[PDB]
């Protein structure tokens, strides 16, 4: 009737991904954790662009679209940053957004690569991840791109540019003991990397009493957050969602009685 | 709603694995076509040597075409049945056909066993060239290949002549579809 | 000497490439107008 006692075993921890296993958890909790990784972990991304000059071959909202998709380092600044909607400022301020500026002019005969290295932020904590660099536009001689942008807080449920993961591999029951997937010909299917079966074996013997547990994660990060910071932010954010829900539930119960 | 949300668990698909057949099934399909071609060749040799006796109510040409079209139709049926019996309970082509959601037994046979005879105006492919359906055949070639019998399945792919004869037969459906659209509601508004 | 079957596929598309290098795809419109 009470909470699970989940355990964590980190299998790999690099700068690009964190691989870990969670045991003694429900499948619903395991899945809701990976959905929070994608959709509910806040990061900082450009969501406001003004283009003073754009002589490039890409139109203004083509450039603005690419700017939003450039990941910005938002490891610790994101937590203390506020949501523009929540902030009381005049639609933008240092407490809820980061100002960015791009001013690139091509005067040389060679093609000028406007990369994220040319994005300059007023907050050193929030910079493009790459600073190879992310290509924004290539400029011909005489063409220029002059714009200023504001990066604000958000999560992947509003736009995929606020999604901090470059890939979230999620798995459970690699040997198919629970028969949650039925193979017409089990011999035809390659073994999972987490499989613990012999070469001759194709499926683990059916486990009627078994339950989904020991979920395998591999959270690849775009660069805005460290792969471990995504998971910690997700667990706290999901816990915040439930704690916020309970507060509203308590009020509704009090009103009913 | 209830079965749309159970299908989130069961899931349903269709892929290449649903179009393959057992190596035993393919050999049986291939054997049926090889025998069917020989049977048609035997019928042709009868007509060529004047050993074919016309059936009542039909001329020699119509007797020959009827005999050939039945041999090829039987081969399509025999091969089509052989393919269907090879399908497992897990096959998704069968699952949609069995439930009546989409597809039919003939589609499975064409995808898996044999597309069959292509017909233009209810007859085999006509001799559009001088006694030839295409320049790649000899003159007076009444064999299944020459007159538009597609011996390959859609999985195996059609040969260049089969592809063209299939387009000829498939162009008839497009014309008929346009004709029906033109006549759509014509009788209704006259009756009304 | 002779184009063997193992080299035929490469050969047939070298011939086709040369045709389109010389003619292009609207050679009918241009040749008719030039005449």
């Amino acid at each position: 009737p009470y909470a699970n006692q989940p355990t964590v075993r980190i299998t790999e921890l690099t700068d690009e991904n964190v691989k870990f296993i969670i045991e003694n958890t429900d499948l619903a909790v395991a899945n809701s954790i990976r959905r929070v990784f994608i959709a509910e972990v806040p990061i900082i991304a450009i969501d406001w662009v003004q283009i003073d000059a754009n002589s490039s071959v890409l139109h203004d909202e083509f450039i603005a679209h690419r700017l939003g998709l450039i990941p910005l380092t938002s490891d610790d600044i994101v937590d203390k940053l506020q949501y523009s909607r929540d902030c009381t400022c005049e639609e933008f301020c240092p407490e809820c957004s980061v100002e960015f500026t791009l001013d690139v002019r091509c005067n040389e005969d060679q093609t000028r690569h406007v990369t994220s290295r040319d994005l300059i932020s007023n907050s050193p904590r929030v910079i493009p991840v790459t600073s190879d660099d992310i290509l924004i536009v290539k400029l011909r001689k005489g063409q220029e791109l002059r714009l200023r942008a504001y990066a604000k807080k958000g999560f992947g449920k509003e736009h995929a540019k606020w999604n901090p993961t470059a890939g979230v591999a999620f798995e459970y029951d690699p040997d198919n003991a629970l028969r949650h997937t039925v193979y017409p010909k089990p011999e035809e299917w390659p073994k999972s990397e987490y499989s613990e079966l012999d070469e001759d074996e194709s499926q683990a013997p059916y486990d009627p009493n078994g339950k989904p547990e020991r979920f395998y994660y591999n959270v690849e990060s775009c660069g805005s957050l460290r792969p471990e910071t995504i998971v910690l932010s997700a667990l706290s954010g999901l816990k915040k969602k439930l704690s916020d829900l309970q507060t509203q539930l308590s009020h509704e119960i009090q009103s009913d009685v | 709603t209830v079965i749309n949300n159970w299908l989130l668990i069961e899931g349903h698909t269709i892929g290449i694995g649903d179009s393959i057949a057992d190596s035993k099934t393919y050999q049986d399909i291939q054997n049926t076509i090889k025998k069917a071609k020989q049977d048609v060749i035997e019928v042709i040799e009868k007509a060529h040597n004047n050993e074919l006796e016309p059936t009542p109510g039909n001329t020699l040409r119509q007797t020959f075409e009827n005999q050939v079209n039945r041999i090829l139709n039987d081969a399509r049926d025999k091969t089509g049945s052989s393919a269907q019996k090879s399908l497992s309970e897990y096959n998704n082509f069968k699952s949609m056909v069995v439930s009546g959601a989409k597809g039919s037994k003939i589609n499975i046979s064409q995808v898996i066993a044999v597309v069959g005879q292509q017909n233009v105006e209810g007859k085999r492919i006509p001799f559009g060239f001088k006694h030839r359906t295409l320049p790649h055949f000899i003159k007076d070639d009444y064999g299944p290949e020459s007159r538009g019998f597609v011996e390959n399945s859609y999985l195996a792919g059609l040969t260049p002549t089969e592809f063209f004869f299939h387009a000829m037969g498939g162009r008839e459906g497009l014309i008929d579809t346009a004709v029906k659209t033109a006549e759509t509601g014509y009788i209704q508004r006259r009756l009304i | 000497d002779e184009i063997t079957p193992d080299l035929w596929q490469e050969a047939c598309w070298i011939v086709i490439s040369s045709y389109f290098d010389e003619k292009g795809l609207v050679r009918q419109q241009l040749d008719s107008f030039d005449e």
Partner: protein
């Protein structure tokens, strides 16, 4: 001077004839553009090939509805002259008449 002939693009008499791809780009022309059309009042106009029966050839057809059992027509046209075409029919009257 007797008039102006509309020019098909990338024909031998077009300004973009024999130009290298760099030369085309300098003129704001796509090197991949095939030409083969006309620019009439700024509209790229393409002449669709029109399919018509061959001329100077004798063709024998049979018509059930008509009063002729057979008819051999021949649309005659000169050698690159006299654009007008004259058709002559040599028909056999149907045997239906009793």
């Amino acid at each position: 001077f007797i008039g102006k002939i509309p020019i098909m693009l990338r024909s031998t008499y077009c300004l973009l004839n024999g130009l290298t791809d760099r030369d085309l780009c300098e003129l704001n022309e796509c090197p991949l553009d095939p030409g083969g059309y006309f620019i009439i009042n700024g509209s790229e106009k393409v002449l669709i090939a029109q399919e018509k029966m061959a001329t100077n050839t004798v063709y024998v057809f049979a018509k059930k509805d008509s009063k002729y059992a057979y008819t051999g027509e021949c649309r005659s046209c000169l050698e690159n002259s006299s654009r007008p075409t004259s058709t002559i029919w040599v028909s056999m009257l149907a045997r239906g008449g009793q």
